[PDB]
Design a protein around this nucleic acid. Structure first.
Lengths: 206, 79, 127, 98, 151, 96, 114
RNA sequence: CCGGCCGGGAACUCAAAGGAGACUGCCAGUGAUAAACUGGAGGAAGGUGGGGAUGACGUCAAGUCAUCAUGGCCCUUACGACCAGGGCUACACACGUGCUACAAUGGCGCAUACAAAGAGAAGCGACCUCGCGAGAGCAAGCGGACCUCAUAAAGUGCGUCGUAGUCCGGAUUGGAGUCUGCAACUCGACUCCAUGAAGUCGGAAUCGCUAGUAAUCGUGGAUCAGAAUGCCACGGUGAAUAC
């Protein structure tokens, strides 16, 4: 087990943080756990909506949750009853007056959360993994994407030993720190157990 | 040792000792409370102290008084 | 008039002020033999002033803080050689040649994880 | 007189915010000292990186809290009216204590 | 030393006599990074050495150290599958480095009161070359003299 | 880590701020150089889990007792996971 | 020089030759020489006889040699006759004050047997 | 009021943001006129300047089902749950990693100088009074370049000790206590008085370190009500040697 998380080593360099509140030591743990609850809830209740990121920020006793998603229409719905329902329950969880926004992730096959969730969904619909991976690399390289690597792992095809079998195309410069590597990871709970899907997407060199 | 202010006994052991000296030393006492400093009124009673599995009887002599109960009930059996 | 040098050495900082005058040295409102001149190597604050001599040449009011004994002393040496812009860049030929204008940038190396100190690895048993 | 002390985790974000509060204040009122920087607090955390034994593998982390101090001198009513409700900062803690 | 040929770092000379030779002698004597203590011992011991021998300071030191410098020393080879102790000519910096190491080590061996007396008596015993460091030099020279047959 | 233990932890906190910080008053004020009676040393028949020295500070997410970090409120494992994803603000790798 | 018993110390500073008395260390010795009005660094040679029995008169006010040895012995016997933890522990010859006997109980337990 | 103490000054240290800087860039020589190497100047730094982060494809069916998640199996009036007491601290032994030592380059007493990095509200807790001391009482200031922790210690200058198991060493043990905590018996930490082992430089063997390094000296922090000789950091002094 030996590679650094390629989001974490780029946190001040190119990648931003998904939480951008300041807090002293008295409320740092409380704000942090409140963020675990709103991302847990808001991740479970938008499983069909293809959600990429949820960014929390707290401007002066009020949360401001931004849902980067690929299907904004299914998040908002017929006149946005679903949004006001979500800020009602996020205001229930965080205990502050909640705002909520939706940022449309166009080009959803270049986002690693959406790619890993895609391949994970296909693996738990019992399709063969080489199609899922290989289709994901092809259609991601089709639109921009100066590199992509996907990597499934663990008891693939229902075996009794676990393999990995990664694929990559293009250039994925993972030790370069100015590389805009969009990396994310999902787990596929199949009837044989968990299958881990990692995906790195190299977008640009700065 | 401990404690500039008061010694320690449990209140249930206080009441069992008061009733034990009032109505005479009749029976050994089930005490789990090893936390408890022997008082001078406890002299002559047979207080069985719990050693993890067994209540072992402790007959209180006059020089037990500056001590906890559990000193007279060893917990580990080494041979 | 009044001639300055910054002069630092392993967590020290020696402000060195020079006026022309006698051969006295005033360090933190204290003489040289009383600041650290009861201790090891007070010669090194006097080394820049033996390249051309200080006999009765210039009074220097110096003010050092941070560091230890030797750290403060090396800081004053570098401070005086930075403060010998009193005379022009003449001195800084020969003063370069003694190795005095070099900021000695040796600092204490950090302690690293799994090592007791900066490089002393903890001893390893049988094989 | 009126010290506004700003704290944030991102130095670009805090010097943007304090540049805005400086030009706001000395644009409306008068006599702003300047964004004095006041040492960064580096809090370091050294966690074990493995879910079991393996002490020697550790990961070191830090949170850098940046301060800035402004210290607005003139107590104009215009600068305290115009100074309130105008921050547009998200990760800044301000202290506007007199 | 596998690849890297090296330079060497320049030591500051002695603050009383300007002698880098004697500065390396107070570094050989120093223990636990305590240099002040070691230079106090060297100034006391060589001061009583200059008072006893009546010569001067560092020429009494230079004579007492001139009697303990090795000429040639043995050295292992392991070339032909055998252990040879070949004699080899000592470099001058190594020569007086070994001189000082033997003086200091033999002075730590002695049984007098203070370190300045142990080392003042060891340098005085090396001035008429009868001490312990001269027995170390004669021992080295018996090893390189017995095994002269390898050059 | 064993649901029971997390429930046990919530019991100890709830008793801790019911009784004590209100009757821990006793141990701060009456056990003192004032008179004495043995009484308030015996008025520690409070339910023993009102004592705040019986909270463990478990991880907020997994209830792990060891490796806790009071700043984040999490064990070292969830601190690293969340730190790398980017949910802990300001926190990044350190090197000096 | 025969103070507090058969103890005869001499040719040594008075703060330190008094430490030969079983039951006075450095503190109690500073207390004896301060209470008897004696300088701390005089020897017993170069010290008068009236001065010596002022030291006898001062050392008599603390429990020393015989009374202290039988007081200590009495304390240990009380513990071993109680049969408390400190007495069973004191009786078997194992460390009393809650120390480690898995290894490194070796003053109390003596040099290792097989 | 001799203290940056005040008015004041923004030079300087410094603080933190933004830039410049080091690239074989220049020179000489050697080299396929190539890569480059060796040496020189300038420069704070010279050749990946120092240190860190960064750990390729894979190996060990290496470690973790006890952080978590999880397939299957299994218990489901019990292998689940609540409680008190105990244990994880046991001790003929053996091994690992450390600390303190065996001393005079030192021990002790008196005076006196020079740090860096940190932490702090159910917290850090001055001053002053009491206690030999650990501490106690009243209690300012500080959510903190402002206050507190907090005196750096080795160093230096005097005096003493004088090669003794000693004024070394502090284990062990008795007594008396302080604090935290419902509660120090099993089973804390610290203090005071007394005790004063083993140990005089370590067999075979073995380990770390190439320069602010090893060695040695202190300080801080996390966990934590209280409990470090460990861990993670910080600075002080500061080597030897590399054919």
């Amino acid at each position: 087990g030996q590679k650094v998380h390629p989001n974490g080593i780029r946190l001040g360099i190119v990648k931003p943080w998904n939480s951008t509140w300041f807090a002293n030591t008295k409320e740092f743990a409380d704000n942090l756990d409140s963020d675990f609850k709103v991302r847990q809830y808001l991740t479970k209740e938008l499983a069909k909506a293809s959600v990429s990121r949820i960014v929390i920020e707290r401007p002066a006793k009020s949360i401001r949750v931004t849902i980067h998603t690929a299907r904004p229409g299914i998040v908002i719905g017929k006149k946005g009853e679903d949004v006001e329902k979500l800020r009602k329950v996020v205001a229930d969880i965080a205990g502050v007056p909640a705002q909520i926004n939706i940022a449309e992730v166009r080009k959803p096959e270049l986002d690693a959360k959406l790619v890993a969730d895609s391949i994970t969904s296909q693996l738990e619909r019992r399709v063969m993994f080489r199609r899922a991976m290989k289709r994901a690399v092809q259609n991601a390289m089709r639109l921009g994407a100066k590199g992509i690597k996907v990597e499934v792992s663990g008891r693939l095809g229902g075996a009794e030993i676990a393999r990995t079998e990664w694929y990559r195309e293009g250039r994925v410069p993972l030790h370069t720190l100015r590389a805009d590597i969009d990396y994310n990871t999902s787990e596929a709970h199949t009837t044989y157990g968990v299958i881990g899907v990692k995906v790195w997407i190299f977008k640009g060199e700065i | 040792r401990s404690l500039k202010k008061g010694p320690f006994i449990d209140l249930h052991l206080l009441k069992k000792v008061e009733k034990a000296v009032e109505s005479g030393d009749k029976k050994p006492l089930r005490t789990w409370s090893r936390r408890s400093t022997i008082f001078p009124n406890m002299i002559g009673l047979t207080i069985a102290v719990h050693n993890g599995r067994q209540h072992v009887p402790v007959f209180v002599t006059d020089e037990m008084v500056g001590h906890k109960l559990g000193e007279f009930a060893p917990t580990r059996t080494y041979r | 008039n009044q001639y300055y040098g910054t002069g630092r050495r392993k967590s020290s900082a020696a402000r060195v002020f020079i006026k022309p005058g006698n051969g006295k040295i005033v360090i933190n409102q204290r003489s040289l033999e009383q600041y650290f001149g009861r201790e090891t190597a007070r010669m090194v604050v006097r080394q820049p002033l033996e390249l051309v001599d200080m006999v009765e040449k210039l009074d220097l009011y110096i003010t050092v803080k941070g560091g230890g004994i030797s750290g403060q002393a090396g800081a004053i040496r570098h401070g005086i050689t930075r403060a010998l812009m009193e005379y022009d860049e003449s001195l800084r030929s020969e003063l370069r040649k003694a190795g005095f204008v070099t900021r000695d940038a040796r600092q204490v190396e950090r302690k690293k994880v799994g090592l007791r100190k900066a490089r002393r690895r903890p001893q390893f048993s049988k094989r | 007189r009126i010290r506004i002390r700003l704290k944030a985790f991102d130095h670009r974000l805090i010097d943007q915010a304090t540049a805005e509060i400086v030009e706001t204040a000395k644009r409306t009122g008068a006599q702003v000292r300047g964004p004095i920087p006041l040492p960064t607090r580096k809090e370091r955390f050294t966690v074990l990186i493995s879910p079991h034994v393996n002490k020697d593998a550790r990961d070191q982390y830090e949170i850098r809290t940046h301060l800035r101090l402004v210290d607005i001198v003139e107590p104009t009513e215009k600068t305290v009216d115009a100074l309130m409700r105008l921050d547009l900062a998200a990760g800044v803690d301000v202290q506007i204590s007199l | 030393p596998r690849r890297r040929v090296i330079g060497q770092r320049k030591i500051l000379p002695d603050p009383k006599f300007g002698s880098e030779l004697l500065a390396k002698f107070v570094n050989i004597l120093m223990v636990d990074g305590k240099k002040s203590t070691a230079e106090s011992i060297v100034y006391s011991a060589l001061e009583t050495l200059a008072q006893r021998s009546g010569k001067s300071e560092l020429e009494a030191f230079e004579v007492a150290l001139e009697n303990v410098r090795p000429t040639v020393e043995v050295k292992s080879r392991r070339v032909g599958g055998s252990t040879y102790q070949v004699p080899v000519e000592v470099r001058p910096v190594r020569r007086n480095a070994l001189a000082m190491r033997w003086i200091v080590e033999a002075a730590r061996k002695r049984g007098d009161k203070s370190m300045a007396l142990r080392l003042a008596n060891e340098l005085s015993d090396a001035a008429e070359n009868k001490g312990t460091a001269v027995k170390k030099r004669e021992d080295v020279h018996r090893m390189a003299e017995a095994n002269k047959a390898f050059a | 880590a064993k649901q029971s233990m997390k429930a046990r932890e919530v019991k100890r906190v709830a008793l801790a701020d019911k009784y004590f910080a209100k009757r821990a008053e006793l141990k701060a004020i009456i056990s003192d150089v004032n008179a004495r009676w043995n009484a308030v040393l015996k008025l520690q028949t409070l339910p023993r889990d009102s004592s705040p020295s019986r909270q463990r500070n478990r991880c907020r997410q997994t209830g792990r007792p060891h490796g806790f970090l009071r700043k984040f409120g999490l064990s070292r494992i969830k601190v690293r996971e969340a730190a790398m994803r980017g949910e802990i603000p300001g926190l990044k790798k350190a090197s000096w | 020089a025969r103070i507090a018993g058969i103890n005869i110390p001499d040719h040594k500073h008075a703060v330190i030759a008094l430490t030969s008395i079983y039951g006075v260390g450095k503190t109690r010795s500073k207390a004896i020489l301060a209470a008897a009005g004696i300088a701390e660094d005089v020897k017993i040679s170069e010290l008068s006889e009236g001065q010596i029995d002022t030291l006898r008169d001062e050392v008599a006010k603390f429990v020393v040699e015989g009374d202290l040895r039988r007081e200590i012995s009495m304390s240990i016997k009380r513990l071993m006759d109680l049969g408390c933890y400190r007495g069973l522990r004191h009786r078997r010859g194992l460390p009393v004050r809650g120390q480690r006997t898995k290894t490194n109980a070796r003053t109390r337990k003596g040099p290792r047997k097989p």
